[PDB]
Design a protein around this ligand. Sequence first.
Ligand SMILES: O=C(O)C1=C[C@H](O)[C@@H](OS(=O)(=O)O)[C@H](O[C@H]2[C@H](O)[C@@H](NS(=O)(=O)O)[C@@H](O)O[C@@H]2COS(=O)(=O)O)O1
Ligand SMILES: O=C(O)C1=C[C@H](O)[C@@H](OS(=O)(=O)O)[C@H](O[C@H]2[C@H](O)[C@@H](NS(=O)(=O)O)[C@@H](O)O[C@@H]2COS(=O)(=O)O)O1
Ligand SMILES: [Ca+2]
Length: 373
Amino acid sequence: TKNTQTLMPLTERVNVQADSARINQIIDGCWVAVGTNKPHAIQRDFTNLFDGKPSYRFELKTEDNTLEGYAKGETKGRAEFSYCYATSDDFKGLPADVYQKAQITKTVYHHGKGACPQGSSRDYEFSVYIPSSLDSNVSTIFAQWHGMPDRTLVQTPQGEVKKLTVDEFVELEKTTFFKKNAGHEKVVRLDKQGNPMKDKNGKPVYKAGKLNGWLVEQGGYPPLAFGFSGGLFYIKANSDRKWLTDKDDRCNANPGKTPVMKPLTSEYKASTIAYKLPFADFPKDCWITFRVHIDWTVYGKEAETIVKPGMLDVRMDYQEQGKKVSKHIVNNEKILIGRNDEDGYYFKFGIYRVGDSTVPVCYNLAGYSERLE
Ligand SMILES: O=C(O)C1=C[C@H](O)[C@@H](OS(=O)(=O)O)[C@H](O[C@H]2[C@H](O)[C@@H](NS(=O)(=O)O)[C@@H](O)O[C@@H]2COS(=O)(=O)O)O1
Ligand SMILES: O=C(O)C1=C[C@H](O)[C@@H](OS(=O)(=O)O)[C@H](O[C@H]2[C@H](O)[C@@H](NS(=O)(=O)O)[C@@H](O)O[C@@H]2COS(=O)(=O)O)O1
Ligand SMILES: [Ca+2]
């Protein structure tokens, strides 16, 4: 379209769990970006409009994996937009310690917009443009509905699972250094001279000592993901009914080896490939609109039961040879989808390169909207 401005880098990034987003960090009034801040990673695209608005071009080159994988030596890349985040306005008028404690418990976004409640019914819609230049063997998730773990739910060194209050978790953090989900003894960093280090505020610099037996809920597979892997486009739903998620339970369906709508299961998890299609058959160089309806599974909290299964419906619309096409790729399928958490789920789209892959990824996304139903 316009050449006065074509590709405009959007380099501001926000850690939604630990920080509120500043005004100059919010994109188009409804997104914040997460991941590598390389200029070419995320750019507003005036050359490819969707709904009369510039779209978002995401790109991860072969050397853009800035994160570590689940296994030693492995890595992963990320450049996404998150619909859920808190702003300073969300904490305006409250005592300063509310925000301070939210940062410590990693629940800042609990005070922001963008998340749906547990067991709710929601409609989502978004569009993606996959250029013919995208390698068929990329391993990337381009849209996902992410969980919001119980940040104060822990397991004592004796094995008991307890939901602490914000204040109690804050107290625990005074003596426990949590590396993701595992708790370690908090050790005071010392320099070569043997003198204790000091952060910007003059406080000691802590480091992780040995494991101290404490665990906190963190991580977990995304309840719903749209992506490419092994030469296939797929839609995968995950369910975790355990009250305190077990990261060691690797129940995760392989798009190519798992039959459609037949969940792979463990005691507490269920992973379902709701739909799969050879990459070559995925429409290229055109905007594809996905209409997704989700009835989130209702869980029993401490009871760890499935109170009510969920449901997933997906429609895929695009223009072919000059005519409107709409495929009902996931037809009102009863399914287990979600996590047994207090909080619900939030949407993200862009690039999440997984499977220890470094294959270049580049495509455009746009037109997100969510409604109640
Ligand atoms: O390895 C990751 O998955 C990961 C590493 C980075 O810390 C961060 O990625 S980012 O730098 O691009 O933002 C992010 O860490 C998050 C993590 O994804 C969250 N998982 S969740 O519990 O399911 O929400 C959680 O652990 O919070 C992490 C950040 O914590 S923080 O740095 O203390 O704020 O992904
Ligand atoms: O090792 C895995 O379990 C794993 C590896 C791949 O990156 C990916 O599987 S996939 O190739 O079929 O997509 C998937 O990545 C997980 C990742 O391991 C999880 N880490 S955790 O929070 O500690 O559980 C998490 O980040 O979710 C990723 C994506 O899950 S998926 O969307 O269910 O695959 O699994
Ligand atoms: Ca939980």
